[PDB]
Design a protein around this motif. Sequence first.
Motif, PDB file in Angstrom:
ATOM      1  N   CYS A 127       0.833  -1.177   0.000  1.00 36.98           N
ATOM      2  CA  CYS A 127       0.000   0.000   0.000  1.00 36.98           C
ATOM      3  C   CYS A 127       0.874   1.236   0.000  1.00 36.98           C
ATOM      4  CB  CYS A 127      -0.986  -0.069   1.189  1.00 36.98           C
ATOM      5  SG  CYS A 127      -0.047  -0.235   2.750  1.00 36.98           S
TER       6      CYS A 127
ATOM      7  N   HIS B 124       0.646   5.142   1.026  1.00 34.35           N
ATOM      8  CA  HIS B 124      -0.120   6.225   1.624  1.00 34.35           C
ATOM      9  C   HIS B 124       0.566   7.555   1.542  1.00 34.35           C
ATOM     10  CE1 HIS B 124      -2.881   3.237   3.158  1.00 34.35           C
ATOM     11  NE2 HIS B 124      -1.829   2.545   3.552  1.00 34.35           N
TER      12      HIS B 124
ATOM     13  N   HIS C  73      -5.354  -2.879   6.695  1.00 33.79           N
ATOM     14  CA  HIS C  73      -6.506  -2.265   6.044  1.00 33.79           C
ATOM     15  C   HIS C  73      -7.818  -2.900   6.456  1.00 33.79           C
ATOM     16  CE1 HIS C  73      -4.173  -0.250   2.502  1.00 33.79           C
ATOM     17  NE2 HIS C  73      -3.498  -0.225   3.640  1.00 33.79           N
TER      18      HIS C  73
ATOM     19  N   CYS D 282       0.979  -2.548   7.719  1.00 34.03           N
ATOM     20  CA  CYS D 282      -0.195  -1.721   7.529  1.00 34.03           C
ATOM     21  C   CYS D 282      -1.413  -2.622   7.475  1.00 34.03           C
ATOM     22  CB  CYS D 282      -0.078  -0.885   6.248  1.00 34.03           C
ATOM     23  SG  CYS D 282      -1.183   0.569   6.343  1.00 34.03           S
TER      24      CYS D 282
ATOM     25  N   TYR E 287       0.235  -8.659  -0.832  1.00 36.23           N
ATOM     26  CA  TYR E 287      -0.309  -7.763   0.193  1.00 36.23           C
ATOM     27  C   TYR E 287      -1.826  -7.655   0.102  1.00 36.23           C
ATOM     28  CZ  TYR E 287      -1.614  -3.828   3.072  1.00 36.23           C
ATOM     29  OH  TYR E 287      -2.253  -3.029   3.977  1.00 36.23           O
TER      30      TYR E 287
HETATM   31 ZN   LIG Z   1      -1.765   0.611   4.038  1.00 35.23          ZN
END
Ligand SMILES: [Zn+2]
Lengths: 315, 317
Positions: free
Chosen positions: A235, A237, B237, B235, A260
């Motif tokens: 990801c 950001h 989500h 991370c 991911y």
């Molecule tokens: Zn993320």
Amino acid sequence: NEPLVFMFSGQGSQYYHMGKELFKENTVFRQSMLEMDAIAARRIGTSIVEEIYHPGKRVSDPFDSILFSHPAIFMIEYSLYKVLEDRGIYPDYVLGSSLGEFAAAAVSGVSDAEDMLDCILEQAIIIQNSCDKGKMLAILDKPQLLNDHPQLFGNSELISINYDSHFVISGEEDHIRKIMEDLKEKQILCQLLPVSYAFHSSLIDPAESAYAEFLRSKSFQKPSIPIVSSLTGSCLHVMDENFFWNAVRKPMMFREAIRYLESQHTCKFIDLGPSGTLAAFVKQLIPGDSADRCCSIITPFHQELKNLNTVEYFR
Amino acid sequence: NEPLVFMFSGQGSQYYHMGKELFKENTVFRQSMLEMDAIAARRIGTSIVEEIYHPGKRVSDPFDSILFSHPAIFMIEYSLYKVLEDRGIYPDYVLGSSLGEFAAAAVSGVSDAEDMLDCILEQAIIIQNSCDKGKMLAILDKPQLLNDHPQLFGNSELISINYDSHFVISGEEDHIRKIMEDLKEKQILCQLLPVSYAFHSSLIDPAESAYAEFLRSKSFQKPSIPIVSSLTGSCLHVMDENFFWNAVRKPMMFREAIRYLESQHTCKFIDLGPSGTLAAFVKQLIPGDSADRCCSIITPFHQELKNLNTVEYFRTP
Ligand SMILES: [Zn+2]
């Protein structure tokens, strides 16, 4: 339910007459192409659209003129995104690969389409003015060959491993042609991609400072739509200064990006790039029975409208 | 240019009088604390704030009562976040560790503070009603000891490796006290954390069933601010229906979270948890010259206002 990933491919996936069925029969697509074509024509001198749909060229002729292919990939991808948007099919994620990271950024809101197209045009111009030509070669075989037989691939750089039987290298023209000769004596199948520059390798480094300077004249927004990036493998950001350079210079981590996403969700993947390259990769990377979680639209079968009907069942 | 990471610690980082200067001198902090205090007091039967700032209790007295420490940690952390946000200091990422994942989630928008506080209160109540007490122990030595001398740590579970000379284990009181005795005979230094449950271990499994039922009664949002979780080291989500149980039950991966963030860019790290525990860890995980990218605010030196000044110069230009 499960999120929709819009995926955008980059250099090497383009071809002549890509999306001609949508350019003719879809107003949103055609209007978006025409609008961007006017912008691009200002900077290049001639129309991009007339080169994409050049009646003297066939699908099999490499569309490798960087001044035309660079903007063409973005214009195609962003116009198709408008088509989906018009039909109320909205991305939960965008995923860019190589030049596709521009379309991903533009769809995310990092920049508007006109500014992104400008950034792409400048990159193409700067690379053409500053860089030697080169080649990118797909190897239809195991990336383990890079470790067991590194000599086979000397004077080239690995730019992408796409699945367990597909990777891509980049290098000078004669170096790549010699690798091709050597691969043939080993019965290792390969395929030249339709590019004239060794993208994603140090052989476009001469373009860096000029393009860095150009990027400082631009201002970009934070992602709004969530971005997954092949350049970072995860990801995205927060974007650093050189993202749009690294989108063309750095190797790809497409498998890490897909891994991911699959760790968080059971996504549906929509390839908005020409040729359906990323959808083919994803089908190789996810469980076999999940192949109908993945579809493409723009392919040389010129069935974009039938394919858009397929996409509606992802809704 | 360097993104800001707000970090939130969990059980083990609390202490009496944490944040007293903010509570007395910062209206935003105080009001946030008093607002949550009224919600928390309805379930615990008395003020959390008056326990935290009880004048007869010292920083060195372990603040290990779960009914008060669970809400107190979240209340302190969320109130400090409100202070920073009021000053225009915004996180690019939040990073939760143990109970601190609730503050990370609230800041992120997964839940509003009042609903997250309810989840914390419920968790404290259920663990108190269903679980035996226990201990957590920080070993100030190499985690290689676990492989080289496993019998030293028998009957304990590894819950966290924090840097090359710090790891934490959890288990029953008597088993933990035995380990401490054995460690002393080996000159291995250790420190009991101020907690009364073996969090992050199977010894709080008696609470899982009731808490998971309670969690099903809730509805949570997707994150609006990127959360990097110590639960996964990445991370996050999506958080599944067990996330807020896993936040206190599962081992942590804090080093992985920090390495993930540092692989994407050079970050500025702000510890919003009491004691500056995570800042201290991060300083050991990143180059020595990079220590000025890491700071804490709430520490027993009671220098929050000075530290908030320091944070000002973390602001993205
Ligand atoms: Zn993320």
